[PDB]
Design a protein around this ligand. Structure first.
Ligand code: C2E
Ligand code: FE
Ligand code: FE
Ligand code: FE
Ligand code: FE
Lengths: 363, 361
């Protein structure tokens, strides 16, 4: 016997999957799979618009690249420009149809149903299309209603996926650019700030931290030197060696960083604050400001020592050319259990090629 | 038919994919449960790690209600993880009949299932009450609810995630804009409020809700370039001379440099506000002397909100201006310092400005 709620459940299930997916590629996939099943159609395609290349595009197979689709021709095109539904009972009795996919693969297209996709403000942003109804000879009035409702969901989840990406990207740009405010009074390039996070990301990832803490270090670590805004010019700008009144001030950037950052309530800023105050501590317990020992340093500080030191050693600094892999490996191998967490050092060594490819690919 | 319930679910799921407020998401979910399960009421309960209780919202988004996490029906499902199907609430020892006693409701059937996070901890309870047949929840019913509960977990977890991202994005803009705090008197709250004023201004000025959110978060970075000013100036204990003043002016350029080139919209606007906020509508400002609509609108809104905040803050020997005093000032500055069309809008809403200034002291 049959299940009355069968499709309802399928649809709940797709809706859970799509709600967890942050990747537009997979959202488009799951959407088309969903439509094929609920519409009982052999195929489906979502078409979206590109402002800059001025065309529609679509992904044909799982995991292969955009296909450009001419905004002005074909069925999709017509729907896109006019705003209205096309229901082709037979595709071959229709001039707007290009039999060319059809020529080559062993496939005959019979029925086509295509509706527009609207953004929140009623602009047509693309087309949703299904092909070859399986449990009937044509697409019905109800099929149209159904797809109109699907197009509504496709739109919402598509936009929401894009908007989460924009906000994620902005949040990064803001940490990067503001973290580099010290730049008028410190040689450190933009990319130093970025790269330190990228290394610490790999580390946290491979030490097996939760996926969220991985994204956290990636973004907390770059703020490690923010305290430098609180250092006197006479000290921050002085080239070469520092006396022992000046160094004592320069060390204080760890405490300043804490001050700047500890005030938030977000986890990002609790982590960033800890990193700022900790990343010059040392596993031995010798490093400043407090001489914290082993596990007394948070793991996020520990990951940041390693990353901070790596990035410095592999850049030209006054009188020292950047270290190659071989020396850097020798150095970490030496400092294992000394400057650094021994466990994290191993992980770092396992992953050293990636560190260097980050370093090479970000000038 | 039976495409009716799919069309309903797509409808609710469209609303939910857009909704960025948790409380609204819980409302939509419980209305979906009601239509999909053909039942009269539905509640969602979430756990607070902090207060160590469950909570729920009722319709109208009034203050959330504490529910005892240990006892009760949601308490049982929460603690044990088992499903509860009651055929008659009033024959059950675990039911609390006071919600009935106050509302005048009569609870008959209750079905409650747990909600799970990805790591598979119980994070709350989904509860459906009074199936519209007047008879029991069936196994096919329980089964539909396990699936609904799965969608609710997802949309919830997603929405709590989005909120963490929002809240941290703000904290970072605020805390890092106040990075000048070791070398400059401007307060954390000054920085926030300037964006709050700009927000209200942008909204009432007609801008899209996305641009309103932007100015709320861009304007607080207007003074970032102060970081680049030499101590021999920013920290000079005197008044400055003209050579030193010219270097001060540069924090506008320094800001633009720090912020620009960012690919995203937020930073384009911030970089513009930073270079523009000391320009004046009549072209007598600095650093470039831009006139009228050559100053971007986000700049124009910030000039206004920044001056507003200054005039209304006490400094020694100089009490803050009150409402009347301040309004006179903006009227006198219309078309000079400030964009006239925008001052008017600002004036229509000046009570809101003082409210902000009053609560975020
Ligand atoms: N063993 C070894 N470790 C290295 C070397 N170069 C960098 N590091 C490591 O990298 C950390 C941060 O270095 P940085 O990026 O140059 O960032 C430095 C740098 O900007 C500044 N600094 C350190 N020494 C001097 C100095 O003599 N003059 C000036 N102007 N600044 C200095 O203070 C920051 C913190 O430095 P540290 O507390 O020493 O902590 C250092 C140190 O452990 C090296 O050649 N050998
Ligand atoms: Fe440091
Ligand atoms: Fe200022
Ligand atoms: Fe300024
Ligand atoms: Fe200001």
């Amino acid at each position: 016997y049959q299940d009355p709620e069968r499709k309802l459940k399928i649809l709940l299930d797709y809706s859970s999957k799509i709600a967890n997916e942050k990747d537009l590629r997979n959202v488009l996939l799951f959407l088309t799979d969903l439509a094929k099943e609920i519409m009982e159609a052999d195929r489906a395609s979502i078409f979206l618009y590109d402002d800059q290349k001025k065309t529609l595009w679509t992904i044909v197979a799982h995991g292969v690249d955009r296909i450009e689709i001419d905004a002005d021709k074909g069925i999709a095109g017509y729907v896109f420009r006019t705003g209205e539904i096309l229901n082709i009972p037979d595709a071959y009795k229709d001039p707007r149809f290009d039999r060319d996919i059809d020529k080559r693969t062993g496939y005959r297209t019979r029925t086509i149903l295509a509706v527009p996709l609207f953004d929140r403000k009623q602009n047509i942003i693309g087309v949703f299309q299904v092909i070859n109804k399986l449990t009937n000879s044509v697409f019905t009035e109800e099929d149209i209603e159904l797809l109109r409702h699907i197009s509504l969901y496709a739109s919402s989840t598509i936009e929401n996926a894009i908007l989460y990406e924009k906000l994620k990207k902005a949040h990064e740009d803001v940490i990067y650019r503001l973290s580099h405010a010290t730049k008028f009074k410190d040689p450190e390039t933009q990319n130093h700030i970025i790269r330190v996070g990228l290394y610490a990301e790999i580390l946290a990832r491979e030490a097996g931290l939760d996926e969220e803490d991985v994204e956290l270090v990636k973004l907390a670590a770059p703020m490690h030197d923010i305290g430098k805004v609180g250092i006197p010019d006479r000290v921050l700008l002085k080239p070469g060696k520092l006396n022992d009144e000046e160094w004592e001030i320069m060390k204080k950037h760890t405490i300043y960083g804490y001050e700047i950052l500890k005030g938030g309530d977000s986890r990002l800023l609790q982590i960033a604050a800890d990193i700022a105050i900790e990343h010059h501590e040392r596993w031995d317990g010798t490093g400043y400001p407090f001489g914290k020992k082993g596990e007394e340093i948070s793991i996020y500080g520990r990951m940041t020592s390693i990353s901070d030191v790596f990035d410095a050693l592999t850049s030209d600094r006054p009188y020292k050319k950047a270290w190659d892999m071989d020396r850097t490996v020798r150095f970490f191998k030496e400092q294992k259990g000394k400057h650094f967490d021994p466990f994290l050092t191993d992980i770092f060594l396992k992953n050293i090629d990636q560190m260097f490819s980050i370093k090479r690919e970000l000038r």
